[PDB]
Amino acid sequence: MKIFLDTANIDEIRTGVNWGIVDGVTTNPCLISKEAVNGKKYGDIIREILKIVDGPVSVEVVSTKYEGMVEEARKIHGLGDNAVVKIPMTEDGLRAIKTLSSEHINTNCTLVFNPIQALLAAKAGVTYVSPFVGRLDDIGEDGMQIIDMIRTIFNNYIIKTQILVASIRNPIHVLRSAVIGADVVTVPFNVLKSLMKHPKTDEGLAKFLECWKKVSPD
Amino acid sequence: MKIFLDTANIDEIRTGVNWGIVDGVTTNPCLISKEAVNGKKYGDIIREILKIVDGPVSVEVVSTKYEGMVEEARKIHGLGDNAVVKIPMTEDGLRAIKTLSSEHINTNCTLVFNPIQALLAAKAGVTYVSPFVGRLDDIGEDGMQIIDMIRTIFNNYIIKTQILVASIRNPIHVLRSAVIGADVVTVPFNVLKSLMKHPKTDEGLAKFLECWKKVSPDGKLIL
Amino acid sequence: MKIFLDTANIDEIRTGVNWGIVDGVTTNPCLISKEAVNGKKYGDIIREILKIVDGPVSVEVVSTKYEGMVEEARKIHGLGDNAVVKIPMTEDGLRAIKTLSSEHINTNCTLVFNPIQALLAAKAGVTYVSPFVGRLDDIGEDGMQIIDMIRTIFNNYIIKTQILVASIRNPIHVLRSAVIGADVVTVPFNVLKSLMKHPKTDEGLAKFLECWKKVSPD
Amino acid sequence: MKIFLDTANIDEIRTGVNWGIVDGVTTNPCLISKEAVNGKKYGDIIREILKIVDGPVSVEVVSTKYEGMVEEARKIHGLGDNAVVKIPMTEDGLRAIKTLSSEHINTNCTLVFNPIQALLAAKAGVTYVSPFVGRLDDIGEDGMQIIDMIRTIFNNYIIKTQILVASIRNPIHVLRSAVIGADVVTVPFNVLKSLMKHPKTDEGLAKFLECWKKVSPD
Amino acid sequence: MKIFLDTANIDEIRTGVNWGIVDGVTTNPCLISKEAVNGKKYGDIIREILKIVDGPVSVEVVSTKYEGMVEEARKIHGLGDNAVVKIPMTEDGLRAIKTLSSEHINTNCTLVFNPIQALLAAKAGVTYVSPFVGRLDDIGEDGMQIIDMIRTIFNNYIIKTQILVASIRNPIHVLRSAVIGADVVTVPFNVLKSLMKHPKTDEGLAKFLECWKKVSPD
Amino acid sequence: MKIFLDTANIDEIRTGVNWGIVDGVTTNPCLISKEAVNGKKYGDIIREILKIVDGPVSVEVVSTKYEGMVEEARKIHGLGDNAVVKIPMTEDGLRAIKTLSSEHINTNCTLVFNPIQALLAAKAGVTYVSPFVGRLDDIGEDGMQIIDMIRTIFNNYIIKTQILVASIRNPIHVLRSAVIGADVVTVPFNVLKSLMKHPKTDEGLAKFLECWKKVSPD
Amino acid sequence: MKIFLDTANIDEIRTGVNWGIVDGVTTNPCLISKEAVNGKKYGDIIREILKIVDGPVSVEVVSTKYEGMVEEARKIHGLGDNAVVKIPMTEDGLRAIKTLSSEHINTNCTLVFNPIQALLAAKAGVTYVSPFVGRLDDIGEDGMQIIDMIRTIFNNYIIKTQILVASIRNPIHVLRSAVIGADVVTVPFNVLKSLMKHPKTDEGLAKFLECWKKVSPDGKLIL
Amino acid sequence: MKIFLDTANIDEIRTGVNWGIVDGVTTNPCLISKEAVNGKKYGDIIREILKIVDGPVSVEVVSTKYEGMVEEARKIHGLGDNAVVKIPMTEDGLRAIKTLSSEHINTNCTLVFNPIQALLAAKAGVTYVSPFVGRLDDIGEDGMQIIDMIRTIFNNYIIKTQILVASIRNPIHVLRSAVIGADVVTVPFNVLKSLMKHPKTDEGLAKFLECWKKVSPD
Ligand SMILES: *[C@@H](CO)[C@@H](O)[C@H](O)[C@H](O)COP(=O)(O)O
Ligand SMILES: *[C@@H](CO)[C@@H](O)[C@H](O)[C@H](O)COP(=O)(O)O
Ligand SMILES: *[C@@H](CO)[C@@H](O)[C@H](O)[C@H](O)COP(=O)(O)O
Ligand SMILES: *[C@@H](CO)[C@@H](O)[C@H](O)[C@H](O)COP(=O)(O)O
Ligand SMILES: *[C@@H](CO)[C@@H](O)[C@H](O)[C@H](O)COP(=O)(O)O
Ligand SMILES: *[C@@H](CO)[C@@H](O)[C@H](O)[C@H](O)COP(=O)(O)O
Ligand SMILES: *[C@@H](CO)[C@@H](O)[C@H](O)[C@H](O)COP(=O)(O)O
Ligand SMILES: *[C@@H](CO)[C@@H](O)[C@H](O)[C@H](O)COP(=O)(O)O
């Protein structure tokens, strides 16, 4: 399972890349605008991320119409071979995904909330589909059940689109995604750092070091 | 399923190897410090186990920092080709696993208590991952459930890291590991010995002896 | 299922009580210390909550020894008949719960992380037991499975201790708690506020407004 | 399981009432506005339905604020003892439901789309809660699953609010509601009439007729 | 589980009655037209079955309109208190059932092919509902699955209508009906006779006899 | 679960009764004829068993016709109040069971090989029904599955006939019968004596006695 | 579910009773002989436990014959009303249970390894039956499965004999017993102590202490 | 699935081999001692079986020490290429199996009672492993569950050791072994003889004979 970082914060990205467990990054207009303060410009933020991250970096178009989306997507593609163009699940978005797929521009269909939406994005040729589990949780539906159905559907038809679990809120979204077999999770930094930790690990380290000090003063 | 002995006791290790049922050994600093009493050096204990065991022998680093771990790991690797470097599930541990993996030094990520820790260790390229079932049992969760989920996750992604069930306390840990499909169990010597035994085996053996005396007073098979 | 509010924030409590959907309140030392800032004393915060809320209000002892816990518990009990004494799952805490229960002082055993701890709390006579699901989620274990087991154990022995699901982080903790049959959930305010909402509720109201305006322009 | 008709069409109600299979009626602002054309007035439609239906008749308030909802509810109540006041799942609606319940005015909480909304409606004392299965179907989630969860939740807490499955589109919604154990279904007239029919019933009737003509030509 | 005989043949009924395993009889226009030949009139056939059979005997109306069904049902009723009036699942049939139920005339709704039809008949007050499992098998649907759903539905609502499995073709319809818990099965004579038989029963009697000859040649 | 002894051997019966775990005895013509050798007569064998056993003793009739079976059954009844008359699953046997049931003579229907046969015996009023699990095993059908279905069927209709598992061959027939909830098992002597035994019991006894000898020389 | 302490150590027993979490005690001849060292008589150990424990205390007979068992059982019964006579699953044991049952002496059938043994003990009228889960674990079968079947069998027949899970080795035996619905578990002291503990409890306690020092330097609750 | 005959009785072996349904033979010291009576020597019995049976013939060592087992095994191997050396699951037995396997002498590990013992035997390189189901049944544990677990374990690791189900007592052991997928069953002669038979086979043949006699009196 690939693990991406769901942030535009340079420091978090830099920190997680230095850990060796971050395989890419996803952004969206709100994540970027959070960092585009104190004079920093959205374009610098994106270019800086594309540089630090050797894996896929997803960058969302802001136009809502087919022609604007394809033009922004070509501009995004031109920023680096690892850029992935994030495109909403809309009629124009599906059209743009199909056109960009033929141009060999990698794409990520976002704002997906049910399995048939995910299937339509895959049929348009999208590289990744991003169902938003946390926002389903917010409205009282277990979001992970949609991941499970998408995994079954994609397996049924040998679909090559990667399931990219997004809107992740806690380490159990991550656990369940791996158990289901989703291809990718993207996680906020606070979640990423928790995934390595467990109280019994720390307890165990402490006890092992005490045994070592019985045989080695240094 | 491979079966490793989880001890640093040399008499136990020779005895188990002699049965032909031990495929390797795991140690940790507490297991080693138990045997390093009355003049026995830790380094001699490690070197002796490496000598008598043909299979993998896991030896744990004691540094907690990335640099100390990789330096110590290269030294452990240098002691014999069957040495496997045991490294804890920490941020520095994962970085060390990735570096050592690329240097073709076999690694065993230890102190793992949930399936996502295990997956992270796999992603860093570790040779073996060791979830501690008995210590999960101690805190009131069925540790074998974590083995089951790890096996499913590894199957999903065709992960080559071997699942090495550790902190084994009883033969049902072993039975459930085999049914799940864990690659390896590491067991204390007391557990190892019990795996061979069953009261009906003893009983059947005595009955076959009694039957054979009816046909051969000296109990031999003359063919 | 009763729904408690898991905060010491007086404004949040007043709002949720005014919504009519809050059956009680849980606090803990960290929640209280968050509010006891810039002159506001912790004793005033506790008393104000007890006054506002008609339902049970859980207030945690701070001593770690049997004698200290019981003494603090009686002071807590004396603040109001709706006070419930929150006591940690420890050896002294069990002894304290047994004494307070024999004194007909309602108790709430907290910091519970597995079903056997919850059972021990029930055997000491505790009124409520509070397993922490979100903290279990944090360490890579699905906390709700512990609630499911506790419900089964409690059903097996006709246990009268109420299961109070705590450390709740999202509305699916709440949903799964109701499907399991937990007696109480205690929820932070941002979770509480989301429980009434659904985008199809908002949409349906807007469509109903359009139809009514056709037969009544006023 | 009670079966209500989901229409404001007086001919459909008369027809289905004359069948003896209709236990009540649900309306909503859009259903009424469809029939309030060519001089027909919403007040007369409502009064005529109340007159013809012995059982419960659900009439929805149009105000969105607590005080207007309660005042409308009392006027709806005054129109007949069989009237049930339909109130949306909103903060103000929950407040209205609680006030009307205490006044022994029967209520029906509408625009419910998940099981926790339904529980909050029951906790306010609502007589009926109406989850909208077809509108869930429309957005790619199997709406009957929410009915199943509500049934389990209500059973767990011995909740007396009746489950009134609404937004019904086909006879399988009806069948699944009956197998789950929902208290009430409300159905459009075209669904209602199909519930009695089956090709093998028609075929069997013709066969028995032919056999009867061999013994009695007349 | 009660067991009825599904035939109008007098010698079959008399034979099954002599065995003590027949609790009632069902007929229909075709079963009656098969025996009403060579000078035998349908009126004598019905009266003669009523006389032999102590328990319920179902006799079908031939009218297809409400008034005729109701008038015919009264004539059937007057023939004997064990007579049960069989009425088809139609609009007029439900109306007739409800009228006859208010007149304390036992009824049996026939030509039922799905569970919701069965529920409608129960709602009209019918004493027995008869789903046709064999005719569903004929069209490629496992008819026993309809019995299972009807059992669940009736259990859910504590429905007093008895499930009468009809159109039985083999002993496994009987086995499955009893495992499900259907109230009654009605069986053709060739099925009824087979129910008592098993080749290991025959073989066991032979062996027991052989042993008895050794100890007692008499 | 009651445990009966399936034998006519006086010594086995005497031995098992002296153990306190034998609640009754079942016989059949072959079991009796095995003991009716060296001059011993079948009548003495039966009378001797009726004397040693305070629980039900089943004694099979040898006639195959209704009138002979009832006359033999009345003779068997006259031998003692604990006698149970065993009667094969046949048309005449069912008739005899119904007649004897009215006379308050306890009966046991034997040679039952499927669940519908068991149901028919229960409908005739039989006290016990004896399905033969071992003889189904012999012909390649798991006999315990028939016990399971009979238990479900009898539970469904609150049937008071006791399920008496017969043709028992091993302790797993016994285990599965108890897990299913059969009322009675009847077991051959070699099976009965094995039920108390386990190697770990003997191993445990030996180890406990060695500890006792460390604190007590005697 | 009741929780008994499976020991004859008086310090353990007083300590557990003091927690208020021990509802009774089980002993056996090996547990008692462990404490009858350096002058301590077995009879004084039994009498002391009977004195300090308010709940049931199971004390095992040492005779293997029916007559010896009932005589010894009447003496055990006479030592206090909370004494429960522990009797092995044997032919003589079942006869002894039936006699003692009719004399209103509470009994605990021990050394049970399968569900039908348990049912036979119930049929003889025993108060408690003690299946040994840990010793089934030792021979490679999941002993908790036997508890589950016994619970089902007892439920089927409304049997009043209490299921007393014994030979408990870890907290998962306890957890699974509670989920199954066993009436009683008897546990060694080490297991008992672990049941109260969890690392997240410790961690949460330390964090609540730290929060409270921000509002009260002396860490007290002044109300 | 191969079917072996579990006996040393030469007449039974000749008969089963003549039936063409016997793929091999297993023996053990008790089975051989049963036949080696009244002058017949055990060495002649073994040699005669090896001659008659074309398939594998399992012959158990009698020594309990490694050196003795290996020496006896080579003498066994030398009697015929179809000899298989049966070795008990003991510490020395595992060592012996490992040595013999490296010498390409086929082995059969016996007295296996749980799945881990079977796994240990496979790891020593044994050709066949023989779990004893009937002896497990004897002690109140369903022996077939051990076969099910061994199959799963062996499948997990692609183990080439054949599962040879032994201590078989009835045809349902055989049926369940085939459904599980065990490689071999070894059966006593009275079990083997029953596997071909079924009362409906006999009945069907008799009916077919009657029909043929109508078109052909000869
Ligand atoms: C792009 C698609 O993978 C991501 O940046 C998504 O927008 C976020 O994962 C959405 O998460 P929130 O629901 O927390 O905004
Ligand atoms: C190394 C990991 O393979 C092993 O030595 C583990 O440290 C032990 O298995 C841990 O067991 P304990 O919980 O008994 O220390
Ligand atoms: C008291 C117990 O009901 C509560 O205040 C709990 O301490 C909190 O629910 C714990 O939540 P966090 O894990 O978010 O502190
Ligand atoms: C009232 C609630 O019982 C009903 O009139 C509902 O508004 C309708 O059932 C909703 O149906 P549509 O989704 O077809 O509007
Ligand atoms: C009346 C309903 O109980 C019955 O006589 C049914 O008409 C028959 O059972 C139908 O059987 P066929 O499908 O074989 O006509
Ligand atoms: C009477 C009915 O319970 C019993 O004696 C049965 O005849 C035997 O249990 C039959 O067993 P076999 O199949 O072994 O004869
Ligand atoms: C009596 C039965 O309740 C107990 O003392 C049992 O003997 C022990 O629980 C057995 O445990 P071990 O297997 O550890 O001896
Ligand atoms: C050799 C192993 O395949 C066989 O002869 C076994 O020993 C027997 O199958 C064991 O059967 P019993 O339990 O009936 O002795």
* F204 alpha carbon, closest ligand: 7
Q: Of the residues C51, C86, C207, C214, which is catalytic?
A: C86
* H20 near E CB under 8 A: no
Strand partners, H2: H184
Block residue for tokens 């070091």: A209
Block residue for tokens 């009916």: H207
H109 → chain B, closest CA residue: B201
Q: How remote is the CA of residue C193 from the centroid of ligand 3, in Å?
A: 18
Taking 3-state DSSP, the helix, strand and coil percentages for chain F, each rounded to the nearest 5, stand at 50, 15, 30
Using CA atoms, how far apart are residues E151 and E159, in angstroms rounded to an integer?
9
Contact criterion met (CB below 8 Å) for G58 and G27: yes
Question: CA gyration radius for chain E?
Answer: 19
A114 interaction partners in chain D (CB closer than 8 Å) = 139-141
Nearest one of F59, F49, F52, F46 to F18, comparing CA atoms = F52
Q: Which of G33, G60, G116 to mutate to test the interface with F (most CBs of F within 10 A)?
A: G116
Using CA atoms, how far apart are residues F217 and C76, in angstroms rounded to an integer?
61
Contact criterion met (CB below 8 Å) for E58 and E25: yes
Strand partners, H47: none
DSSP chain A: -EEEEE---HHHHHHHHTTT---EEE--HHHHHHHS-TT--HHHHHHHHHHH-SS-EEEE----SHHHHHHHHHHHHTT-TTEEEEEESSHHHHHHHHHHHHTT--EEEEEE-SHHHHHHHHHTT-SEEEEBHHHHHHTTS-THHHHHHHHHHHHHTT--SEEEEBS--SHHHHHHHHHHT-SEEEE-HHHHHHHT--HHHHHHHHHHHHHHHHH---
Q: Which of H138, H169, H193, H202 to mutate to test the interface with F (most CBs of F within 10 A)?
A: H138
Is there an atom of ligand 1 within 6 Å of A4 CB? no
DSSP chain D: -EEEEE---HHHHHHHHTTT---EEE--HHHHHHH--TT--HHHHHHHHHHH-SS-EEEE----SHHHHHHHHHHHHHT-TTEEEEEESSHHHHHHHHHHHHTT--EEEEEE-SHHHHHHHHHTT-SEEEEBHHHHHHTTS-THHHHHHHHHHHHHTT--SEEEEBS--SHHHHHHHHHHT-SEEEE-HHHHHHTT--HHHHHHHHHHHHHHHHH---
Using CA atoms, how far apart are residues E4 and E195, in angstroms rounded to an integer?
13
Nearest one of A167, B183, C208 to D64, comparing CA atoms = C208
Of ligand 7's listed atoms, the one at least distance from the Cα of G31 is: 5
| CA distances from residue G182 to A69, A74, C119, G191, H127 in whole angstroms, order as listed | 64, 67, 13, 17, 43
Number of domains within chain E: 1
* B29 near A CB under 8 A: yes
- CA-nearest residue for atom 5, ligand 4, is D27
| CA distances from residue F175 to F1, F168, F193, F201, G162 in whole angstroms, order as listed | 11, 11, 14, 18, 19
F198 → chain G, closest CA residue: G113
Q: What is the dihedral of CA G116, G117, G118, G120, to 10 degrees?
A: 90
The H or E element that residue H50 is part of is helix H42-52
Q: How remote is the CA of residue D188 from the centroid of ligand 4, in Å?
A: 9
* G131 near H CB under 8 A: no
Residue B204 tokens read as 């059947």
Q: Is A86 a catalytic residue?
A: yes
The H or E element that residue H42 is part of is helix H42-52
Angle between helices C91-102 and C115-123 (to 10 degrees): 40
Backbone angles phi, psi at E113, to 5 degrees: -125, 0
Using CA atoms, how far apart are residues H39 and B86, in angstroms rounded to an integer?
65
Using CA atoms, how far apart are residues G198 and G207, in angstroms rounded to an integer?
15
For the annotated catalytic residues of F, the residue numbers are 86
Q: What is the dihedral of CA C94, C99, C105, C108, to 10 degrees?
A: 0
Backbone angles phi, psi at B25, to 5 degrees: -135, 140
Strands H25-26 and H57-60: parallel
Cα C54 to chain centroid, rounded: 14
C139 interaction partners in chain B (CB closer than 8 Å) = 113-114
Cβ burial of C160 (10 Å; 0-12, 13-18, 19+) is exposed
Looking at CA atoms only, how far is residue D36 from chain C in angstroms? 7
Is there an atom of ligand 2 within 6 Å of B110 CB? yes
F143 interaction partners in chain H (CB closer than 8 Å) = 172
Using CA atoms, how far apart are residues G48 and A87, in angstroms rounded to an integer?
78
Nearest one of C91, C35, C25, C95 to C60, comparing CA atoms = C25
Contact criterion met (CB below 8 Å) for H172 and F142: yes
Which of D29, D94, D113 has the CB atom closest to C208's CB atom? D29
Using CA atoms, how far apart are residues H144 and G193, in angstroms rounded to an integer?
39
Looking at CA atoms only, how far is residue D114 from chain A in angstroms? 6
Strand partners, G83: G57
Block residue for tokens 């979100």: C134
* C115 near B CB under 8 A: yes
Contact criterion met (CB below 8 Å) for C130 and C110: yes
Chains touching F, CB cut-off 8 Å, 3+ pairs: B, E, G, H
Q: How remote is the CA of residue F167 from the centroid of ligand 6, in Å?
A: 5
Residue E73 tokens read as 């049902």
Strand, coil or helix: G83: strand
Using CA atoms, how far apart are residues D53 and D48, in angstroms rounded to an integer?
9
The H or E element that residue G20 is part of is none
* D32 alpha carbon, closest ligand: 4
B170 interaction partners in chain G (CB closer than 8 Å) = 134, 137-138, 169-170
Nearest one of G196, G162, G189 to G1, comparing CA atoms = G162
Using CA atoms, how far apart are residues E8 and D217, in angstroms rounded to an integer?
20
A118 interaction partners in chain D (CB closer than 8 Å) = none
Using CA atoms, how far apart are residues D12 and D22, in angstroms rounded to an integer?
11
Looking at CA atoms only, how far is residue C41 from chain D in angstroms? 32
* D190 alpha carbon, closest ligand: 4
Residue F8 tokens read as 């006519």
Contact criterion met (CB below 8 Å) for G161 and G122: yes
Residue D78 tokens read as 């005054």
Using CA atoms, how far apart are residues G135 and G28, in angstroms rounded to an integer?
15
Signed CA dihedral, H164, H170, H175, H176: sign only:
negative
Is there an atom of ligand 7 within 6 Å of G130 CB? yes
In terms of residue numbers, what domain contains B52? 1-223
- Assign 3-class secondary structure to C56-101: CEEEECCCCCHHHHHHHHHHHHHHCCCEEEEEECCHHHHHHHHHHH
C-beta atoms surrounding F192 within 10 Å: 25
Q: What is the dihedral of CA F109, F114, F115, F117, to 10 degrees?
A: -40
Is there an atom of ligand 1 within 6 Å of A7 CB? no
Using CA atoms, how far apart are residues H59 and H56, in angstroms rounded to an integer?
10
Cβ burial of H207 (10 Å; 0-12, 13-18, 19+) is exposed
β strands within chain F, DSSP E: 2-6, 24-26, 57-60, 83-88, 107-112, 128-131, 162-165, 184-187
Backbone angles phi, psi at B113, to 5 degrees: -125, 0
Residue H134 tokens read as 């009937």
* G64 near F CB under 8 A: yes
Is there an atom of ligand 1 within 6 Å of A162 CB? no
Q: What is the identity of the amino acid at E115?
A: P
Is there an atom of ligand 7 within 6 Å of G132 CB? yes
Chains G and F touch (3+ CB pairs under 8 A): yes
Using CA atoms, how far apart are residues D64 and D90, in angstroms rounded to an integer?
9
Using CA atoms, how far apart are residues C44 and C54, in angstroms rounded to an integer?
17
Using CA atoms, how far apart are residues B153 and A176, in angstroms rounded to an integer?
10
| CA distances from residue A118 to A57, A98, A143, F187 in whole angstroms, order as listed | 20, 14, 13, 62
Strand, coil or helix: B166: strand
| CA distances from residue F138 to D58, F109, F169 in whole angstroms, order as listed | 65, 21, 10
Looking at CA atoms only, how far is residue H144 from chain G in angstroms? 13
H115 interaction partners in chain G (CB closer than 8 Å) = 140
User: Could you tell me which residues come within 8 angstroms of residue E210 by beta carbon, excluding any fewer than 6 positions away?
Assistant: none
Residue G38 tokens read as 């350096």
- Deposited resolution, Å: 1.8
Q: What is the identity of the amino acid at B197?
A: K
* F55 near G CB under 8 A: no
Q: How remote is the CA of residue A139 from the centroid of ligand 1, in Å?
A: 16
Using CA atoms, how far apart are residues E87 and E84, in angstroms rounded to an integer?
10
Helices (H), chain B: 10-19, 29-35, 42-52, 66-78, 91-102, 115-123, 133-138, 144-157, 171-180, 189-195, 199-215
Q: How many Cβ pairs closer than 8 A exist between chain A and D? A: 17
Backbone angles phi, psi at C132, to 5 degrees: -100, 105
Q: What is the identity of the amino acid at G39?
A: G
Chains F and D touch (3+ CB pairs under 8 A): no
Looking at CA atoms only, how far is residue G38 from chain F in angstroms? 11
User: Could you tell me which residues come within 8 angstroms of residue A110 by beta carbon, excluding any fewer than 6 positions away?
Assistant: A28, A58, A60, A86, A87, A88, A89, A130, A132, A166
* B131 alpha carbon, closest ligand: 2
Using CA atoms, how far apart are residues E171 and F87, in angstroms rounded to an integer?
23
Strand, coil or helix: G87: strand
Angle between helices B144-157 and A171-180 (to 10 degrees): 60
Cβ burial of F40 (10 Å; 0-12, 13-18, 19+) is middle
Contact criterion met (CB below 8 Å) for H42 and B217: no
Angle between helices B144-157 and B115-123 (to 10 degrees): 40
Block residue for tokens 């009355």: B38
* G195 near B CB under 8 A: yes
Residues within 6 Å of ligand 5 by CB: E 6, 26-28, 31, 58, 86, 108, 110, 130, 132, 134-135, 164, 166-167, 186
For the annotated catalytic residues of E, the residue numbers are 86
* A129 alpha carbon, closest ligand: 1
Which of H32, H117, H119 has the CB atom closest to B1's CB atom? H119
G199 interaction partners in chain A (CB closer than 8 Å) = 199-200, 203
C-beta atoms surrounding D2 within 10 Å: 18
Strands G128-131 and F162-165: unpaired
Altogether, the residues listed in chain H come to a count of: 218
| CA distances from residue B171 to B148, F192, G112, G192, H125 in whole angstroms, order as listed | 17, 31, 20, 22, 22
**CB within 8 Å: C112 and G219:** no
Is there an atom of ligand 2 within 6 Å of B25 CB? no
Using CA atoms, how far apart are residues F49 and F31, in angstroms rounded to an integer?
13
Using CA atoms, how far apart are residues A32 and F173, in angstroms rounded to an integer?
70
Residue C74 tokens read as 């009686």
Contact criterion met (CB below 8 Å) for G122 and G102: no
Strand, coil or helix: C112: strand
Looking at CA atoms only, how far is residue G203 from chain A in angstroms? 8
Using CA atoms, how far apart are residues E207 and F3, in angstroms rounded to an integer?
25
G200 interaction partners in chain A (CB closer than 8 Å) = 199
